[PDB]
RNA sequence: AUUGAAAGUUCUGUUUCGAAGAAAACCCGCCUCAG
């Protein structure tokens, strides 16, 4: 199980609107993170024949684990929800085993935007390594699933709804999955939460929780 | 190539006209550079 870390510098922020008034999300979903990685290999093409229907040139990277977190302060504003965090820093962790270290590192440098066109984001540095699996009590900053238990004080937790990769195809809505975000609503920031969990990969001290 | 893809809330307008800080008032009364 290989892992990679990337540091991104945002220009003005990101904007992803909720499916189904156009409120937006607080942090990008894993689908956007996987699509940004896939942009490095599928550049120039917008429709691929999956075999039955044209849905996206991203239905092949669906099994790559990804998380992300903030490192600065921002504000969420509706004026079409937007998350303004100019000159901020984003840390993205990719955990997978499908490809070797070289391919993941090459695709990691090829991230251009997160969300829509205006949300450009440069790349400052990357790290690649081998991760270890643990199950003891850990402290994490990355968001995780709803079913994961919590031992600490419930004070900085929010509930959001994301979608699986089934939504990659047009004319079809993805499955609803609940997610827990350790975020302060105003001003925007990230806080540490202690969880027990069952699977946690150590990617340099900042344990990443998946289930 | 990411609930992503496709879009200007843009066009037209004077804070303008008018109204003396003006009138009265002494620096002035005393002193050899001398043998």
Swiss-Prot record:
It comes from the Archaea. One of its GO terms (biological process) is defense response to virus. Coiled coil: none annotated. Gene3D superfamilies: 3.30.70.3120. One of its GO terms (molecular function) is RNA binding. Keywords: Antiviral defense, RNA-binding. CRISPR (clustered regularly interspaced short palindromic repeat) is an adaptive immune system that provides protection against mobile genetic elements (viruses, transposable elements and conjugative plasmids). CRISPR clusters contain spacers, sequences complementary to antecedent mobile elements, and target invading nucleic acids. CRISPR clusters are transcribed and processed into CRISPR RNA (crRNA). Belongs to the CRISPR-associated protein Cas5 family. Subtype I-A/Apern subfamily. Cloning was done with strain P2, while interaction experiments were done with genes cloned from strain P2 but over-expressed in P1. The aCascade complex was purified from strain P1. Part of the aCascade ribonucleoprotein complex, minimally composed of Csa2 and Cas5a, which binds crRNA. Other possible components of aCascade in strain P1 are Cas6b (SSO1437) and Csa5 (SSO1443), while SSO1399, Cas5b (SSO1400) and SSO1401 have sometimes been seen weakly associated. Csa2 is probably the major RNA-binding subunit. The Csa2-Cas5a-crRNA complex also binds target DNA homologous to crRNA, probably forming an R-loop. Purified aCascade forms a filament about 6 nm in width. This is CRISPR system aCascade subunit Cas5 1.
